[PDB]
Subunit: 121 residues, 2 copies
C-alpha cells in the first residue's frame, strides 16, 4: 500500500490499468503532465483511466518539516552528483569504444588485404 | 549568493575555507555528519572552519508546501531512474569494450599470421 513514486502511504491511492502499481493521485497526475505515460511502462495512459481506491509544539513541528525538507534536498543533490559522475564515465566509455571500432576496422582491412594477397600466391 | 547544495538563498550563509563554495549552514553540517568532507573536495572539513557571513493565508501556504514537496519527490524519483538507466548503459559499454578488445587481439593475431605467411613468399 505504498506509492511507487514517493514510497509513502497514499492519501488518495490510485492503481494503474495497464500495470498494477499504486500511486498518489496528485503525484501521478503531475507526472503525467509532462510524460503522460507510466514510469516504466512505455505505453501512455489517459487521465480518467487510473482506478481510484478507498481506505506537540508548533515550532517543533515546523522544525520537523524543515528537517525533512533538508533531507530531501540533500538526497536530490547526492543523486544528481552520482548521475553526473556516471554520465562522465559513460561518455569516456563511448569515446574508447569509438576508437576501438576504428582500430577494428583497420585490422579487418589489413587482415583481408594480406589474405587476398596470399590467395594470389 | 546561492547555496551549492540547495540552489537557494541561505539565511545563515557559510563559505568554505578549503574551497570558495557557499552553503546553507544546517545543510552543509548535515552533509558533513555522514561524510565529514566537502562535496567535490576529497579532503575533510572541520566544523568550525566554515566562515559565516553577516546580513499571507495559511491554506495557500500549506498548498505551496505540498507543491514543493511533490516537486522534490518527483525530481528525486526521476533522478534515481536516470541514474539506474545510465548505470545499465555504462555496464553494457564496459561489456562491449571487453568484447572489442578480444576481437582486436584475435584480429591482430590473424593479421600477423597472414603477413608472416606472405613474408615466406
Amino acid at each position: 500500500m505504498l506509492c511507487a513514486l514517493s514510497g509513502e502511504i497514499p492519501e488518495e491511492p490510485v492503481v494503474s490499468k495497464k500495470t498494477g502499481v499504486l500511486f498518489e493521485k496528485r503525484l501521478i497526475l503531475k507526472y503525467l503532465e509532462e510524460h503522460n505515460n507510466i514510469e516504466p511502462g512505455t505505453t501512455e495512459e489517459l487521465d480518467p483511466e487510473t482506478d481510484l481506491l478507498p481506505i506537540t509544539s508548533i515550532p517543533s513541528l515546523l522544525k520537523a518539516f524543515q528537517d525533512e525538507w533538508d533531507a530531501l534536498v540533500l538526497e536530490t543533490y547526492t543523486t544528481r552528483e552520482q548521475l553526473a559522475r556516471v554520465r562522465e564515465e559513460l561518455a569516456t566509455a563511448l569515446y574508447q569504444h569509438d576508437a576501438a571500432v576504428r582500430v577494428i576496422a583497420r585490422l579487418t582491412r589489413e587482415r583481408d588485404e594480406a589474405r587476398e594477397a596470399l590467395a594470389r600466391l
